[PDB]
């Protein structure tokens, strides 16, 4: 079967910037390529198809060229809206088979976090574990720093982090730490500390409660 | 024009299971019908494909689905569907319905093969205050916690709140069991008469719970 290899995996654009996607053939395919667009929690959208045509509705910014087997799909100028992975496909002959996909990141200027913090709920507790949660919300670049802090004493080993995709409009993330410990862990110390450290912040930022307070 | 998926969920490997997809406004009898399924680790994958009466419906398979799947349709209900027995983990994935061109997609149906046990998670509230308050903002959220396996989906309101909603991709704790968080700002004055309520359903376990999520003062008042 035919493989089709496409690069970059991953592309960091400013909007405004051109973007260019390429995939190769393991064997000519004619024209028979098509590029699909496939925004997060959303399934693929056809963008361009015989390689160069661009399908109903589809803006001017998107293009593609090519034959045989060199493919390229372009973005002229990148807009916010455009934040997705995209992938090629090759129609001419079975199996017909997909490009690994690229990912855009879209760069932008820096946007320092609002920082949030919850305590465990009242229901978790009776059940005997304290879930802690930090909330990042709408920031930008994705590299951040959060630093659990428990009386003073730097934590290791017992919180997780998840990262949303990019905003379609704002092109920030949002970012989760939960700190998790036995409610016998949790009922032994007082303060419970959540330390960002960002780019946009011009120094580390930290939200706190007391183990009662709330 | 509209596909529409349905057929899925969770099964032992070895087994078997059947997906269905229903087309309106366009004439189904005149389009080839494809399914096409993506995980994360695999990316796309084109799985089956079905022609037209003229054919006599020729069909066509990825060599990995071989003697495995199979591919039918109903014009006359514009339906078309896929049979799928002795399941593999690596058959895992969401699967979409696609007619030739594939001008147009469904929203899929998640096909999970897993010989583990299912387990529903708890819905935890993520009170706003003013810990989680910022220049007349507040955030909330729920906690959705030990679960398998995936996916949980979470709305708010019942769909009548999507601005500034944000659901973290689901995390495996290290017991093996799947948390995540869904979060949402909020004006702070809107705490005293909205009513704030996350929807969650992780159909494999069947659960559906509604999470009403109360504000906490703290201190704020003193
Ligand atoms: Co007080």
């Known amino acids: 079967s035919i493989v089709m290899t496409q690069t970059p995996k991953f592309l960091l654009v400013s909007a405004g910037d051109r973007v260019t996607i390429t995939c190769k053939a393991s064997q000519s395919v004619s024209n028979d390529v098509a590029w699909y667009q496939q925004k997060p929690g959303q399934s693929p959208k056809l963008l361009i198809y015989?390689?160069?045509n661009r399908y109903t509705g589809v803006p001017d910014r998107f293009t593609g060229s090519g034959y045989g087997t060199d493919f390229t799909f372009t973005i002229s100028t990148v807009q916010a809206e455009d934040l997705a992975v995209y992938f090629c496909?090759?129609?001419?002959?079975?199996?017909?088979?997909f490009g690994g996909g690229t990912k855009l990141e879209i760069k932008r200027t820096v946007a320092a976090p609002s920082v949030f913090i919850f305590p465990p709920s009242d229901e978790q507790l009776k059940s005997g574990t304290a879930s802690v949660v930090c909330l990042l919300n709408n920031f930008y670049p994705r590299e951040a720093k959060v630093q659990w802090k428990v009386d003073n004493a730097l934590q290791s080993g017992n919180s997780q982090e998840s990262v949303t995709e990019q905003d379609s409009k704002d092109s920030t993330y949002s970012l989760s730490s939960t700190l998790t410990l036995s409610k016998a862990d949790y009922e032994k110390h007082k303060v419970y500390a959540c330390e960002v450290t960002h780019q946009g912040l011009s120094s580390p930022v930290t939200k706190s409660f007391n183990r009662g307070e709330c | 024009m509209k596909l529409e998926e349905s057929g899925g969920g969770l099964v032992q490997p070895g087994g078997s299971m059947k997906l269905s997809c229903v087309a309106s406004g366009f004439t189904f009898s005149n389009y080839w019908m494809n399914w096409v399924r993506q995980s994360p680790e695999k990316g796309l994958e084109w799985v089956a494909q079905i022609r037209l009466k003229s054919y006599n419906y020729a069909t066509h398979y990825a060599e990995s689905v071989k003697g495995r799947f199979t591919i039918s349709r109903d014009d006359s209900k514009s339906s078309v569907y896929l049979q799928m027995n002795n399941l593999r983990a690596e058959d895992t994935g969401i699967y979409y319905c696609?007619?030739?061109?594939?001008?147009?997609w469904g929203q899929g149906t998640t096909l999970t093969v897993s010989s583990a046990s299912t387990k529903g998670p708890s819905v935890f509230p993520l009170a706003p205050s003013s810990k989680s308050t910022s220049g007349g903002t507040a955030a909330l959220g729920c906690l959705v916690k030990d679960y398998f396996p995936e996916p949980v989906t979470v709305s708010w309101n019942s769909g009548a709140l999507t601005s500034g909603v944000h659901t973290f991709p689901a995390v495996l704790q290290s017991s093996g069991l799947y948390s995540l968080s869904s979060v949402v700002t909020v004006p702070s004055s809107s705490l005293g008469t909205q009513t704030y309520i996350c929807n969650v359903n992780h159909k494999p376990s069947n659960t559906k719970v509604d999470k009403k999520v109360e504000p906490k003062s703290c201190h704020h008042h003193h």
């Open positions: 496909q090759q129609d001419y002959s079975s199996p017909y088979t």
């Open positions: 696609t007619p030739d061109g594939s001008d147009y």
């Open positions: 015989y390689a160069s």
